[PDB]
Amino acid sequence: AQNPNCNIMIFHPTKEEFNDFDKYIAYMESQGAHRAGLAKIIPPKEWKARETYDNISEILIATPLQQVASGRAGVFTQYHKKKKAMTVGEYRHLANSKKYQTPPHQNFEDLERKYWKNRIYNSPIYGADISGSLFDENTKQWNLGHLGTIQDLLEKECGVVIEGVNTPYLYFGMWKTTFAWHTEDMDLYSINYLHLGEPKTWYVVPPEHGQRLERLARELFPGSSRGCGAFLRHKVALISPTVLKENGIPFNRITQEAGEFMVTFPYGYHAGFNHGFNCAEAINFATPRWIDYGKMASQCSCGEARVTFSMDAFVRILQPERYDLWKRGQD
Ligand SMILES: O=C(O)CNC(=O)C(=O)O
Ligand SMILES: [Mg+2]
Ligand code: NI
């Protein structure tokens, strides 16, 4: 078995290997990358996402989200308070302000220490989940707006044509902005490109151990767990690496820098934080190997998770027994 310790793997494809996206994902899996739940892909030196980032300041963040924490430093939830619209240029200036800027630090490890010590005492503002793309239309390789769609994959594997669409999302971050512990909708893959700015630190639990994280989460968030049998789908719970280690949960960590891709694999729980002002693009995708994960994915039906239009068909076709309850949660 390749990668039996489930380490995060880093890949350096050549420009020739960067042509065929599906082929390369399958290659990474042949080497055991998916066992980690997360892999890093460093693009060939010849590649670029676009020519410059000099002209992005007029993008609008219609609903910036202030991430307010509750709990203790290593075990907390966050809720998202909606703020007034602002442009990317305004948000960048806010991120760089004395109130929100990255503190002085020695290295990524020092900064990580500071994050987990102090995160709860601040409320950073995240420009998350903005439909759009920063890839140039002429970028032919690993362009996240030109990937094969999940609806086409389901049709190719299973024969059923379905409605829905699959487009990327932009994320503008600042110091301490946080992504809570989650797997993707329908336990899909994700791919994330860090276009510019400061790094993003990731934590990940191997897919084969995801239920160990779920069991800890039910212990640590006992009210939430009574409310919903899949409350991690709400994407609000944080657990620090120290707490995970104290509880014997297998996990790994890595820091993504500008110019790098990360892929999350089906049922790979992940969480993390941004180091300072940055912009990422991410989208979900599927492969043939995903279908069995999609059929077994948990679902939130309590009403909290509320998701895209396109998840309807995935539940309807892959999980017809669950469909009626899940759709009630959507309504
Ligand atoms: O970058 C973020 O805030 C969160 N991203 C993801 O969870 C992802 O790409 O799957
Ligand atoms: Mg602009
Ligand atoms: Ni994700």
Ligand SMILES: [Zn+2]
């Ligand atoms: Zn729920």
